[PDB]
Subunit: 312 residues, 3 copies
């Protein structure tokens, strides 16, 4: 199609740059400058709004393209194959075209507000400058083709079930675990400390299982879950804690996402995460909160997941 | 006997409740409400007084019953068999009957002072309420049978060597290690942080080795060691640290306990604990004290254990 | 030779003491009293000056003697064989005789300033006192033989290369990593916290690989690298951080040391260190600094090592 043809031209312009980027650099776990959690949350919110508006089948296809790209990584910089680079870019271009321009620009603007002005020059300094310049000229041509195809209005929101078994169970989980939620330091930098002993390629294989799960999940359930997180961001207090009602709606929506893929897909995520998560990480997190509230939350989670399991 | 027959009736009333308690919940590592270390120490002291007064052969038998019960645990909640539930309850009833009523009530009163009033309702909320009520009615009938057999005066105290090789060596250990003892934060919540990567059932198998060791140990030596801890609690300062003299008496008494079982029984404890203790736990503890005082204490310990080893 | 013959007499006098010392005690990782980092750095500086003045072939031979001695360790206290004790003492005596008396006395004076006056008595208390006294009388006789052979003036400095590929690359590494260097707490006691789960004998086998590497490295390159550290100490600020220029000269000098042994010698060090370094140690260090500056330093290091690798 037009975007796919344009992605091939973009690859001609940009794959030399892609091969030189060191994708295994740990810097990409960090914020693009000083960490500003609530300012960053505004940018994530714009992304969540955009993802909720995007065509669910095109989001699926873009996830699938990234899964395939992970399988073709080679060499010391972690670069995917030329064909997969193009396949990812085409799929993302189709996603971009499925939402109105203002939603895309809102992401750009909100990310630019948290990005240190010196970040582009530092990134470019690690690669061949002419190749980066050629890649960017390629991007500018590509986005013109994307815009030609781009919708001018956003699709409406998802339907939200009420009183289903997961929703009822989520109320109980949320009441039991909100004290724990309120204890957690949502503004900490700890979430960007690296996983001890885990290479980027090993992390990527765990992320892959979540990408695969996303591609399998029900698109309407995913959309509704994104919408619930947008609501929740809007209701935070000064410490970043969402309201109790919005938390419960997040838990219900995520339970419905879990139940929209088979057990094996979810266990693949869990098992891959278990392989990369040092056992001191849960201990460190637990140690920062009230231990009674954490055990109350965990007991409630293990009860809730039985309701999800039955629905799944 | 009368208590054993009553324990069978108690089991008819209470085993349904036992099967539904989630014995693998980590909450039981935590204080029953907000941690109040010096108030809890008062409760532990009442337990120590009671244990020192109890019949050593009945304490032994109760330890043995728990060892046997650990072997029959099954199912997702960690419940022991019906037969072993009864065997534990009978053995504990005999222990209770071997001390005067006031010592038992002193434990109840001192634990009640640290227990949040909402704890019973939270526990009951996790199980079938009718079964918990039936279990408690069973307990009330059982305690009447126990009371009929209960002594009215406490048995006398233990015999204690003075100037034996272990006692002399304990003086040296204690002088070398009291600076370390004083450094430790006895009022911290860290001792209730869980063992990373270790399930409740794995921890239980390590605890089993200590229960086995207690069942083998000399009852008079155990009694004397309990009495030494009661005295040591009496002399604590405002930070919880006992006097140097009472510390030395504890070390001597514990050395005599160690030497009252064979080497293999003690090494079974050590090896099981090594299997559940993350190597960062000793480091974390060491990092909170003066490193010279910790090495002085450790060197003194490894000297002391040679005297214990020879006596053993 | 005269020093070797005298080392045999020293061994007759001191090996009984050596067998008694508990060389596996962790206390030797710690400062000899309260840690005083900048005062200790003055003593290290005197050792660096002395090492830079010492005969490089005799330093090599003394490193080799320690490598051999590690291989003959036996028994619970970690003592090397009698023959290797003598071989080490003779080799060290020859090193001492290769520098002027004032450089040796300067080390003694600067270490004595950081050593708590009670340290000698505590060490002696752990061994047979008569054997320690016999060993010290032996040392006093030995040092008289060493002095008879001792030079009266210091050998000259090393040649400092300029503009070689390693030096040019070190400029770039140093510019990129100086922000990280400035963040590190150089005055912390953390560097003397022990390695979790690693015995002294396991640590010793990792140190052995560095001793072997030192014995193989170019003596002039080692000398120049010592001299660069002496200069860097001279330019420290109140937090202990050397100047940017002296840091760059250290990096250049160390790169030349690395490139003066084959890759396999360096990888033997790395692999042995990987076997004794808990993966939480890099995380703990990373967590104390700016994560962007640490990743900038690391990316620059992995670029720099490619230049070293080509030269090597
Ligand atoms: C249902 C559900 O769960 O959905 C989930 C789905 C996902 C996908 C997983 C997900 C996500 C992530 C999302 C949405 C990411 C969105 C990314 C958007 C990127 C936008 C970009 C780069 C935009 C721009 C705009 C630019 C403009 C450049 C110029 O105008 C400038 C300034 C000046 C002009 O003179 C010239 C110009 C050159 C024209 C530019 O250069 O770039 C999320 C949040 O998890 C939700
Ligand atoms: C650790 C490791 O190894 O990770 C490996 C992981 C993988 C996945 C295997 C891998 C890979 C591939 C990767 C990451 C590819 C990333 C591609 C990103 C593509 C982004 C695109 C196209 C984004 C946009 C945004 C657009 C915006 C367009 C507009 O806003 C613009 C401007 C101006 C408006 O006026 C009009 C507009 C139209 C609204 C657009 O048109 O396009 C790799 C490299 O191997 C690394
Ligand atoms: C199209 C598109 O946009 O896709 C995007 C969609 C998203 C959603 C935005 C997105 C994402 C994120 C995704 C998918 C996240 C997935 C999360 C999965 C979580 C799974 C969990 C917690 C699983 C488990 C399993 C457990 C098991 C526990 C037990 O068995 C254990 C051990 C032992 C038993 O004795 C008891 C037991 C208790 C039974 C547990 O405790 O937990 C992504 C990547 O961006 C792609
Ligand atoms: C910086 C900042 O301020 O950020 C703010 C951002 C927000 C969004 C506003 C905000 C918030 C709210 C947040 C994060 C809420 C998070 C909720 C997470 C819910 C996750 C759920 C339910 C996941 C699961 C996984 C499940 C797995 C189930 C199974 O695998 C299990 C086990 C075992 C299998 O055998 C069977 C199975 C069924 C397969 C399940 O059943 O459920 C907050 C707090 O305000 C912070
Ligand atoms: C570009 C940029 O800046 O992006 C920014 C974007 C954001 C969104 C703003 C952002 C953010 C915030 C994020 C991701 C927050 C994530 C928070 C996660 C918190 C996780 C917690 C608490 C986990 C746990 C696990 C626990 C386990 C407890 C137990 O298992 C334990 C031990 C032992 C068992 O016996 C009992 C048990 C009870 C079961 C616990 O107790 O707690 C950030 C970082 O600012 C970056
Ligand atoms: C030598 C040596 O080392 O010994 C070691 C031995 C051990 C065993 C290992 C050891 C230990 C632990 C010990 C001793 C534990 C002791 C536990 C005691 C439990 C006591 C209980 C539950 C008592 C009560 C009392 C109750 C009263 C209820 C009522 O009166 C109430 C209010 C009102 C009435 O109207 C109705 C009523 C219903 C009548 C009740 O309901 O319960 C230790 C410390 O390590 C020392
Ligand atoms: C992680 C995991 O799996 O752990 C597993 C570990 C095990 C061991 C295998 C296991 C098990 C079994 C367990 C824990 C059993 C516990 C039993 C407790 C019994 C307690 C008893 C009888 C206590 C008392 C107290 C009494 C007090 C009586 C009086 O004070 C009363 C009232 C009133 C006074 O006026 C008169 C009095 C007479 C003075 C009494 O008469 O009796 C299980 C379940 O499998 C879990
Ligand atoms: C009837 C009744 O009431 O029973 C109750 C009685 C109690 C007492 C109240 C009770 C309890 C608690 C109990 C039993 C506690 C037991 C504690 C045991 C501690 C044992 C220790 C530290 C053992 C070791 C072994 C070590 C070995 C070290 C070395 O070998 C190593 C690696 C390598 C060699 O090269 C050098 C070495 C240096 C030689 C060491 O360093 O330490 C309980 C459970 O309540 C039951
Ligand atoms: C909250 C609060 O305030 O609490 C307060 C409570 C108190 C009680 C008042 C208090 C206090 C004092 C305390 C805790 C003192 C603790 C003393 C512990 C002593 C433990 C000893 C000796 C244990 C052992 C184990 C041994 C093992 C020996 C062997 O295995 C070894 C190695 C190797 C084998 O080959 C041979 C072997 C021979 C088998 C041994 O020889 O000895 C304090 C500080 O005031 C705090
Ligand atoms: C190029 C390269 O790689 O260099 C590296 C090489 C190394 C070797 C690895 C290295 C190193 C370490 C170095 C140099 C260590 C130096 C050690 C020196 C020790 C000196 C000693 C014990 C000196 C003395 C002096 C004493 C004097 C005693 C008396 O006078 C006193 C007071 C009073 C008189 O009345 C009696 C007396 C009895 C006469 C004594 O008793 O002891 C370094 C730094 O890494 C650099
Ligand atoms: C964990 C573990 O197991 O580690 C194992 C590691 C090994 C390596 C295997 C091992 C071993 C052996 C070891 C450590 C041996 C150490 C030997 C040290 C020797 C030091 C010597 C000779 C130092 C000096 C200093 C001198 C100074 C002389 C003068 O200044 C003096 C006074 C006075 C001036 O007026 C004149 C002077 C002339 C200037 C001198 O003449 O001599 C062991 C024991 O097995 C432990
Ligand atoms: C004669 C005399 O005086 O001798 C004395 C001389 C001295 C010098 C004073 C002395 C000393 C100290 C010495 C020798 C120190 C030696 C330091 C060596 C440092 C080596 C380092 C960091 C090596 C590496 C290797 C790495 C590998 C990384 C990778 O491969 C990895 C994993 C995976 C790939 O995919 C990518 C990769 C990135 C390629 C790395 O990242 O780092 C001593 C002991 O006193 C003796
Ligand atoms: C207390 C106090 O204040 O102390 C003050 C003390 C000072 C000295 C004044 C001071 C300072 C400065 C300091 C410490 C500087 C430290 C510099 C360290 C440089 C280390 C280097 C370059 C090491 C290496 C190792 C390399 C390995 C390369 C390879 O193995 C690699 C990877 C992979 C293989 O396949 C190939 C290979 C080629 C084999 C390499 O290429 O390089 C400061 C900060 O002021 C503090």
């Amino acid at each position: 199609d037009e975007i796919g043809d344009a992605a091939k031209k973009l690859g001609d312009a940009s794959y030399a740059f892609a091969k030189e980027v060191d994708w295994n650099n740990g810097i990409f776990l960090q914020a693009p400058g000083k960490l500003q959690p609530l300012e960053a949350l505004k940018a994530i919110d714009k992304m969540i709004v955009m993802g909720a508006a995007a065509d669910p089948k095109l989001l699926k296809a873009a996830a699938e393209a990234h899964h395939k790209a992970i399988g073709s990584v080679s060499g010391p910089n972690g670069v995917t194959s030329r064909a997969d680079w193009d396949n990812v870019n085409a799929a993302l271009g189709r996603v971009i075209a499925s939402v109105p321009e203002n939603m895309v620009m809102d992401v750009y603007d909100s990310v630019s507000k948290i990005t240190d002005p010196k970040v582009p020059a530092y990134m470019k300094s690690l690669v061949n400058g002419a190749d980066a310049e050629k890649a960017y000229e390629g991007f500018l041509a590509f986005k013109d083709v994307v815009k030609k195809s781009q919708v001018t209005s956003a699709a409406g929101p998802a339907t939200v079930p009420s009183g289903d078994k997961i929703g009822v169970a989520a109320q109980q989980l949320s009441e039991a675990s909100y004290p724990f939620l309120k204890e957690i330091d949502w503004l900490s930098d700890v979430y960007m400390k690296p996983l001890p002993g885990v290479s980027a390629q090993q992390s990527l294989k765990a992320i892959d299982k979540m990408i695969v799960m996303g591609a399998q999940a029900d698109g309407n359930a995913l959309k509704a879950a994104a919408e619930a997180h947008h609501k929740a961001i809007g209701s935070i207090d000064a410490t970043g804690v969402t309201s109790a009602a919005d938390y419960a709606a997040v838990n219900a929506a995520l339970g419905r996402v879990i139940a929209s893929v088979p057990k094996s897909t979810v266990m693949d995520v869990y098992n891959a995460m278990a392989g990369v998560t040092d056992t001191s990480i849960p201990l460190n997190m637990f140690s920062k909160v009230n231990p009674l509230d954490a055990n109350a939350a965990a007991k409630a989670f293990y009860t809730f997941k039985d309701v999800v399991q039955a629905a799944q």
